[PDB]
Amino acid sequence: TIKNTVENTVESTHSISTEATPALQAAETGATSNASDESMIETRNVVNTHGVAETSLEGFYGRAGLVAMFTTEGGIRSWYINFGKYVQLRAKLELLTYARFDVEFTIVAQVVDEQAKVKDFNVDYQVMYVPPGASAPDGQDSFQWQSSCNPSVISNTGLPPARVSVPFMSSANAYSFSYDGYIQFGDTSSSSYGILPIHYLGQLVVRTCEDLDSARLRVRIYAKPKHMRGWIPRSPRMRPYVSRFTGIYTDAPSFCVNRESITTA
Amino acid sequence: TIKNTVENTVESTHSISTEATPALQAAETGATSNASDESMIETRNVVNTHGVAETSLEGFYGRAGLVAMFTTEGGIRSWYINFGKYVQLRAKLELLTYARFDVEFTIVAQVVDEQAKVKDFNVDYQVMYVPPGASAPDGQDSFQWQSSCNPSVISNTGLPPARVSVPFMSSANAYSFSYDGYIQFGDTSSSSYGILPIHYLGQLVVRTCEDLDSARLRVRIYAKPKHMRGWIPRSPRMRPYVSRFTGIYTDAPSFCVNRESITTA
Amino acid sequence: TIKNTVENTVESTHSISTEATPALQAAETGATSNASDESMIETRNVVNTHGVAETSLEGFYGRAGLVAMFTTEGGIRSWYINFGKYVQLRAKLELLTYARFDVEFTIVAQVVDEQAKVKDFNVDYQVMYVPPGASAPDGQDSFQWQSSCNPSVISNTGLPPARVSVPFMSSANAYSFSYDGYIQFGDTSSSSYGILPIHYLGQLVVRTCEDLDSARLRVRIYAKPKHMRGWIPRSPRMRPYVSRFTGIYTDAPSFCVNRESITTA
Amino acid sequence: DRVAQLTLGNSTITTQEAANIVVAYGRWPSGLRDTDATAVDKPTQPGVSAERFYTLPSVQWTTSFTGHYWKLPDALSDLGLFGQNLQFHYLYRGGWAIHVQCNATKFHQGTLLVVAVPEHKIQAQSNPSFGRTNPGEAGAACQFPFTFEDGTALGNALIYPHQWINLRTNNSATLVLPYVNAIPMDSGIKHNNWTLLVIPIVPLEYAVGATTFVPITVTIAPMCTEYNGLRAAVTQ
Amino acid sequence: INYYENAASNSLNKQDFTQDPDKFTRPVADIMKEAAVPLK
Amino acid sequence: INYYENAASNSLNKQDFTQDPDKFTRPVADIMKEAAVPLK
Amino acid sequence: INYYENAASNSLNKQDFTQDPDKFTRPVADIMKEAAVPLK
Amino acid sequence: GCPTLYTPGSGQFLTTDDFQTPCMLPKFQPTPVIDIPGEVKNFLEVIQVESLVEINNVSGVEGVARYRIPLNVQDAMDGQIMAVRVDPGADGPMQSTLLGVFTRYYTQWSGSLDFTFMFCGTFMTTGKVIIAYTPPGGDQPGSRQQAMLGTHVVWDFGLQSSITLVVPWISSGHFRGTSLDNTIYKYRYYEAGYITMWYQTNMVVPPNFPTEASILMFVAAQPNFSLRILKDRPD
Amino acid sequence: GCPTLYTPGSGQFLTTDDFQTPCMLPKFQPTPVIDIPGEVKNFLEVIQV
Amino acid sequence: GCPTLYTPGSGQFLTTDDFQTPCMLPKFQPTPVIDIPGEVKNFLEVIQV
Numbered sequence A, B, C: 001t002i003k004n005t006v007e008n009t010v011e012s013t014h015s016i017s018t019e020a021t022p023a024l025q026a027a028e029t030g031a032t033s034n035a036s037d038e039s040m041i042e043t044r045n046v047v048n049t050h051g052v053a054e055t056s057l058e059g060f061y062g063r064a065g066l067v068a069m070f071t072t073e074g075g076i077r078s079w080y081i082n083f084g085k086y087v088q089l090r091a092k093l094e095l096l097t098y099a100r101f102d103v104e105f106t107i108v109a110q111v112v113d114e115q116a117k118v119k120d121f122n123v124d125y126q127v128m129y130v131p132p133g134a135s136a137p138d139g140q141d142s143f144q145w146q147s148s149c150n151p152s153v154i155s156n157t158g159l160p161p162a163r164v165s166v167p168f169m170s171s172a173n174a175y176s177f178s179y180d181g182y183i184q185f186g187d188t189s190s191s192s193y194g195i196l197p198i199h200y201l202g203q204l205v206v207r208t209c210e211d212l213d214s215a216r217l218r219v220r221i222y223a224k225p226k227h228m229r230g231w232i233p234r235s236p237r238m239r240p241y242v243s244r245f246t247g248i249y250t251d252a253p254s255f256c257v258n259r260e261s262i263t264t265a
Numbered sequence D: 001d002r003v004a005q006l007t008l009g010n011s012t013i014t015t016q017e018a019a020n021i022v023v024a025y026g027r028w029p030s031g032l033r034d035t036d037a038t039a040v041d042k043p044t045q046p047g048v049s050a051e052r053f054y055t056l057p058s059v060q061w062t063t064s065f066t067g068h069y070w071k072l073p074d075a076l077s078d079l080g081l082f083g084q085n086l087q088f089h090y091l092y093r094g095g096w097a098i099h100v101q102c103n104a105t106k107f108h109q110g111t112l113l114v115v116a117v118p119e120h121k122i123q124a125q126s127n128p129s130f131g132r133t134n135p136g137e138a139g140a141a142c143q144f145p146f147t148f149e150d151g152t153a154l155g156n157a158l159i160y161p162h163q164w165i166n167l168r169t170n171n172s173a174t175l176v177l178p179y180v181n182a183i184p185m186d187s188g189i190k191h192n193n194w195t196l197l198v199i200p201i202v203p204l205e206y207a208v209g210a211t212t213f214v215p216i217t218v219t220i221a222p223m224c225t226e227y228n229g230l231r232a233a234v235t236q
Numbered sequence E, F, G: 001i002n003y004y005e006n007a008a009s010n011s012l013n014k015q016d017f018t019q020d021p022d023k024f025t026r027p028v029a030d031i032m033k034e035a036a037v038p039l040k
Numbered sequence H: 001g002c003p004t005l006y007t008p009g010s011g012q013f014l015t016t017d018d019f020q021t022p023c024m025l026p027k028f029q030p031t032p033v034i035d036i037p038g039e040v041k042n043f044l045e046v047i048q049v050e051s052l053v054e055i056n057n058v059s060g061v062e063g064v065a066r067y068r069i070p071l072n073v074q075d076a077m078d079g080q081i082m083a084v085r086v087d088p089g090a091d092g093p094m095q096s097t098l099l100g101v102f103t104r105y106y107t108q109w110s111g112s113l114d115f116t117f118m119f120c121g122t123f124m125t126t127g128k129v130i131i132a133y134t135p136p137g138g139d140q141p142g143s144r145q146q147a148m149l150g151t152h153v154v155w156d157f158g159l160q161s162s163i164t165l166v167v168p169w170i171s172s173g174h175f176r177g178t179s180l181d182n183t184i185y186k187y188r189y190y191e192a193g194y195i196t197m198w199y200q201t202n203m204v205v206p207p208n209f210p211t212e213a214s215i216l217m218f219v220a221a222q223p224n225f226s227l228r229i230l231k232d233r234p235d
Numbered sequence I, J: 001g002c003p004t005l006y007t008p009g010s011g012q013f014l015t016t017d018d019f020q021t022p023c024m025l026p027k028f029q030p031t032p033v034i035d036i037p038g039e040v041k042n043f044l045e046v047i048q049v
């Protein structure tokens, strides 16, 4: 059953009885306590109108965050599409085991000198999406940039940022943020463990349409999930990340700060 | 009869009989096999909802691809309108014998130095369409650029790209991607063979409205078909192209990679 | 009576008779022949759906063409409004004796050096319309540029082109592309012949709002007729134009190319 | 069934080892409609004088046989009153019935693909000769069968209408083709609409001492024909 | 829908028909039928 | 809603169905049912 | 109103309710009422 | 006029976009559509036609000889004739087929496959063969006992020249990837199994006959087959 | 106000275009149409002479 | 066409914005939703454990 506000409070009087015992509990059973406030103290009436909308999945997930940041070398660079390099959005998506969503991508680009000092100079750029089994371009002027089948976006550093939507593209019925298994049959190698090849959907490749003199493009990508669905909440991550493609971590003897004694608040 | 999803699967039991033989076939007749899955093994019920839309003609053909790329010489250049120079869109259109479609053309232009290094400089450009029997301009300042009958588009390298639609313009009832014949009566010359003059619709001519100092325009054109209709599917092309206006090719002894033996997968 | 397609064709059989003679004609009467195809040969049925819209007056006349092109001298220039300097649109309007139409004017402007080489520099320009009997400005800073009664348009070389509509403004019930008469009473001078003062509607004057250093404006004007009406078709022009305000021409002994003999095609 | 009889005009063909009949793109030959017609003069329809079987000269299935082809209507352009009507008129339209024959004993093995292709160009060489492009009623040899003379895989020819002659199963192949073009009618002397190709994919072999000389024979009928634009007679 | 006040602001006409050409092709006082001779 | 005069101006078609392929897969004069033998 | 063809183009959902949490908080085979003792 | 606000993505040229545009020739009326045979609306109609497999792809074998599988009279029992991987987008024998070329235009596939074989010996030649499909989990089966534990057919050469094996869709997910390329994306995860052919009895002939004969192999899609996400053909 | 997005082809001057525009003289009333012989509506009428 | 006026905030990228946009793949149909245990709609359900 569904609700748009939190629970109200009713009046409650004193109780002296053997028949009703709401304070006694048994944690062994695996259930969380069911003692209400009104059972434990004398309460007054409160009509409570606080809403629940900021903690919905759309509420928590529906805003853009950084996924990639790079510069061109010899008028080109490419990026493997994967949300592991920047930890803030990574740490939020690993609160669910399985999720389905669409994504809205935003691209921001600018010209820099060789000293990484920004330049007031407007240039045309191209982004191409290359799915697995397609040939990627080798350099700034390769003939794969015709883009007659592969999708492209073309734009200029003096217009506002580029933006496109993408639908739910997995071969599975949901993406997976945990996978306890191996990549393929007959390869139990330790580097083949805990990767699902089904989340890998390919590369983005970037170029300047013409050769800059001395300068380079710098590029940033932001991603925003839309229409979230989610199953099986996980325990939140509590140690630093180490690697882009694995959950590897180092141990330590505490999680919170220490104090002088257990009896001093 | 028309369908929006692929075929379902029904339950099937064992069969021991002389009366029904779906596995036996005769390829000699020119027909493709009609053995269903359910006839060949015991099957379960599956309600299959996969759609068929990405493989429609609009699906396969409806996206832009490169058709021309050139620079001005002495403030001018011209292009014969023909989709043969860049092989990716050429190889897709030769999957049909006859097609009717409208086209959406997109023009992207920029200024370069004599070393082909790009320049931050905004300039006015003009594109003129010159049908056969019309006089083309000779240079940057010829009086054919008045454009009072011939269509033109005028634009600037600092606005977004120019774009126009065009309808189905052939004298025939469809374009032709194969033509087994000669151009004209009494000329069986080998250079007169396999060209249809009916697909030739003229030139585009480009200039800068004023003279640049030292710099040149570089220009790219993308084409996108719309409202496709198609007849008589052809075998796909399997050897490199050699020439813009002909199907000429060189032979070779295989199409796929070799292996050590027929019994080793 | 009005039609949206060309005429169909009916079946026709052989005829042997004294009573009906459609091939015999008399050109002396001033009438064009009335022999139909079906009367002259045996025909088949054809349902013909070809339309007639590209040859309507709106069809033929409804597209923009060049009328003026000039540069400023000391920050100013003016233009007498008259379609005679560029021959392509002139030669089309002289296919009618009398016409009524509205006009859509488009203005394209840019900065050049003293060597007529274009400059990447954005500047404010003003265009003023000065009807006959109004005082025109003398220079870049004259007080007639207040424009409180005369219409103006103000714009910048870095925005898209300026554009305005104008209604049918003659004192007559139509414009005239031929006039066999004199300008005024008691002046049969040869320079007073074949001009109608009623088509003269005034000047345009152009300035830069502020003084450029060394550079000049270059300006082009395009005109497009709209809502055409037309009376009394004329023979088309067949010799070069010589002068902006008159029909003067030089004679020559042929119009088409010669051949070796009348019996050789 | 495995027996068949085809009758057109004054001509009849029989076979006892058939394998059904193919009707290309699910269409039979038909007349030009009043909505689709353009030329205004009354057409000529000769009937039984043009629409009948003609037999072309035979080809030997040798040890070195790579394959052979014919162009339509080039092959029949100089035969009977089909030929004379095509020379005297500017425009032509029509369909075809085709029957290929090749017989050999129960002691022989081999297989031929028999395929009709629309708008087939010859292009293994920079400049095809007039001899190679219009070889007449004798036809011409395939020099490049694996690339199907046109830069495509031989294996994918089965997208066009076809049959096989497999010597253990059948001795004849039969195809029925309607008119295909981007226009309602066309010149018979400047443009070939169809090509008929015969290619061995399993070579001819036999029990030692069996008959070695084995011909292949092609028989063709025009079907549903019409002509327009009469003048003097003209040829390439 | 028209956005501006004066009709000179409006877009191009879409009434692109033709008509019977006899005011230019056969402008004669007495009728001369196809099947007849003109002068009698 | 269409904003322009000529149909070449309009956006892409949205009728993305398939149909029965027998004109290419089984173009034969006499029917051969699945359960039967082809040549008889 | 939706301007584009595919649903991935549409804006964010506006159905921001919550529901009864017992599938995570009390997932036990036999019911244990508030006023009673749990183990009996 | 109306107040407005312009959003990011303004002025961008996306090749898969879909908007209305002004036409260069507003009053042009095109020619009529005429009746032409063989109209196509969807390329699933084309992929459902059989085409030949380049199965004998070994070093010394060239041109039309690469389409034939050999058979010959045996002097021992239960021997192997051929093997191949069933994966339709993979490099190897399938890649030049109709079904192979269209599968190389797309990243994902689903559905059953039709494999069909035709015998080209003399009328007097006889034999029986067994054809098996093995689902994924290891290497190709090493003997006829190991092969016949999966989905199979026994074929007897007689009057009807040909036989079909159907390779049914047995998969964990609803779709598979078309590449099997392991260097970047570990897509060897999607490998779909093997098909193999063995002697059931022997090829038997009369005296002085040809002791070697050929088979031809055809592949096509079934009516539950489909494709997603278009990409540029690498050939 | 309303969110919008501006597409390629923005700001281009195509000579065969067809849009509404502001008029230089909004209140001007033109002279009447009078009866004149020999009105033409289509140049197919002329080519037939 | 229609007269318009463009307001401040034009061309800005605000991360919590909410507008419709063109899709890279307009004809793509995604896999079905299947029955999976333990669907969550609001993180208030989780915090109550």
Ligand SMILES: CCCCCCCCCCCCC/C=C\[C@H](O)[C@H](N)CO
Residues within 6 Å of the ligand: A081, A082, A083, A084, A103, A105, A127, A128, A129, A151, A152, A153, A164, A166, A169, A175, A176, A177, A199, A201, A204, J024
């Ligand atoms: C031209 C615009 C480029 C758009 C390219 C779109 C490619 C599709 C991306 C879909 C998003 C996939 C997210 C799935 C899983 C995450 O990456 C996980 N961190 C994997 O561990």
Ligand SMILES: CCCCCCCCCCCCC/C=C\[C@H](O)[C@H](N)CO
Residues within 6 Å of the ligand: B081, B082, B083, B084, B103, B105, B127, B128, B129, B151, B152, B153, B164, B166, B169, B175, B176, B177, B199, B201, B204, H024
């Ligand atoms: C100002 C904008 C320029 C627009 C000019 C439009 C001209 C019409 C082009 C129509 C497209 C023709 C396509 C027909 C056939 C292909 O070229 C084939 N490859 C020919 O072999």
Ligand SMILES: CCCCCCCCCCCCC/C=C\[C@H](O)[C@H](N)CO
Residues within 6 Å of the ligand: C081, C082, C083, C084, C103, C105, C127, C128, C129, C151, C152, C153, C164, C166, C169, C175, C176, C177, C199, C201, C204, I024
């Ligand atoms: C600020 C925008 C400027 C608009 C000025 C409008 C003035 C009115 C012009 C109307 C067009 C007149 C055309 C009439 C006749 C032609 O000029 C003939 N060639 C005269 O021989």
Ligand SMILES: [K+]
Residues within 6 Å of the ligand: A005, A006, A007, A008, A047, A048, A049
């Ligand atoms: K409440």
Ligand SMILES: [K+]
Residues within 6 Å of the ligand: B005, B006, B007, B008, B047, B048, B049
């Ligand atoms: K279904």
Ligand SMILES: [K+]
Residues within 6 Å of the ligand: C005, C006, C007, C008, C047, C048, C049
């Ligand atoms: K009509």
